[PDB]
């Protein structure tokens, strides 16, 4: 099972769902990220937030679409793609995906990479039409060939990361020490079919991004 | 002096720069920065950048108006961004914007916020159309009533921000003990002329922003 939550940031900034939709895949959403949902064809199988955050003539057309959706209340304190993400954890989920989540306001990004950071032991990628974003605690990984993206950046989230150690990329790293503040961002490409980073301490974050130009 | 950076982001998410030109404005053109910069009629005192990373026909363009423009090239494993702010660190400055940093490559965003953390005692600021994003040392900060900016937030980057407090706030905070993963971030709005923040220990980023709710 797949849990894919679709938020309510800028709309030119989503991929085109269509190619994220699968059978194992259960749609959520949050706040007028529902209005997207919506349009695909898709019913979301839970919403987060409240109508105010949709347009009148928007709430007329969701409810028409699904009376009887299960929709969630916002809650005081938290963003409703936290409520939402706090239950999507709790699924037992092979992947979970934000959309939605990047663009516009800054910090609603950052406070959305700060949930990544909270629940960093689980399998959670940010994703827009340019990127995928993802924060990892020690371990090996792998990376797979993909034609969305060409470039790979590792930037530390913890003061220090050991044991950094690449394989299959264009410059290579084999028990390569990092501090934050003296090792800002790696980049870095994946060369072979496949690849690993891997790293016995401390907290990273994997940027895998796109541009016009990478169409290679 | 005042230092103003335009990097290679996406064009759309940059404020008027027109706002924010003055005689005492130095401009500093990064990668296709340079192209946004002629265009607007602002003239960079220098360059970061290869010409091959730009488009064809402004190639042309930008060496057949400007050729005496002086351009350092790229270096070893640092952004063309990076090279640009390490130099004008070193000059002095009362202020750095950089515009153009945000949006597109996420890469690009989150490497730029690494520098502003990297030279954190260095007045810095990243500025698009709806955010002015810093970062602080322990020290007591004024911030300024700012009609473009209803939205202030506060999100820790150390482990730990100790003895958090603001005043002037409308969600007030006195001696609050922050701690990374357990408070994600903290959101608010300045309801007063000018407010404070400070915190005793650690690294926090200050994001001001606006979007269509601001009357």
């Given at each position: 099972?797949?849990?894919?939550i679709?938020?309510?940031?800028?709309?030119?900034l989503?991929?085109?769902?269509?190619f994220?939709?699968?059978?194992?895949?259960?749609w959520v959403g949050v706040?007028?990220?529902?209005?997207?949902?919506?349009?695909?064809?898709?019913?979301?199988?839970r919403?987060f937030?409240?109508?105010?955050?949709?347009?009148?003539?928007?709430?007329?057309?969701l409810?028409?679409?699904?009376?009887d959706l299960?929709?969630?209340?916002?809650?005081?304190?938290?963003?409703?793609?936290?409520?939402?993400?706090?239950?999507?954890?709790?699924?037992?989920a092979?992947?979970?995906?934000?959309?939605?989540?990047?663009?516009?306001?800054?910090?609603?990004?950052f406070?959305?990479?700060?949930?990544?950071?909270?629940?960093?032991?689980?399998?959670?990628?940010?994703v827009?039409?340019?990127?995928?974003?993802?924060?990892?605690?020690p371990?090996?990984y792998?990376?797979?060939?993909?034609?969305?993206?060409?470039?790979?950046?590792?930037?530390?989230?913890?003061?220090?990361?050991?044991?950094f150690t690449?394989?299959g990329?264009?410059?290579?790293?084999?028990?390569?020490?990092?501090?934050?503040?003296?090792?800002?961002?790696?980049?870095?490409?994946?060369?072979?079919?496949?690849?690993?980073?891997?790293?016995?301490?401390g907290?990273?974050?994997m940027?895998r991004?796109?541009d016009?130009s990478?169409?290679?």
């Open positions: 099972m797949i849990i894919h679709v938020g309510g940031g800028p709309r030119e989503l991929p085109d769902l269509r994220y939709d699968g059978e194992d895949v259960c706040d007028r990220g529902t209005m997207t949902l919506l349009e695909a064809g898709f019913r979301p199988v919403a937030g409240d109508f105010d955050s949709l347009p009148a003539e928007d709430v007329v057309k409810q028409q679409a699904f009376p299960d929709v969630w209340p916002a809650e005081k304190d938290k963003t409703d793609m936290e409520i939402a993400l706090d239950w999507a954890v709790e699924q037992t092979r992947c979970i995906r934000l959309f939605g989540a990047t663009g516009g306001r800054l910090d609603h990004l406070g959305n990479v700060e949930l990544l950071l909270k629940y960093a032991d689980r399998p959670i990628e940010i827009d039409r340019q990127n995928v974003l993802t924060v990892h605690l371990g090996t792998t990376v797979m060939y993909d034609a969305r993206y060409c470039y790979v950046s590792y930037i530390p989230v913890s003061e220090t990361v050991a044991e690449l394989t990329f264009k410059y290579p790293l084999t028990n390569c020490h990092i501090s934050r503040g003296s090792t800002l961002c790696i980049s870095n490409e994946l060369i072979q079919s496949s690849g690993t980073f891997s790293f016995s301490e907290i990273l974050m940027i991004s796109s016009s990478c169409l290679l």
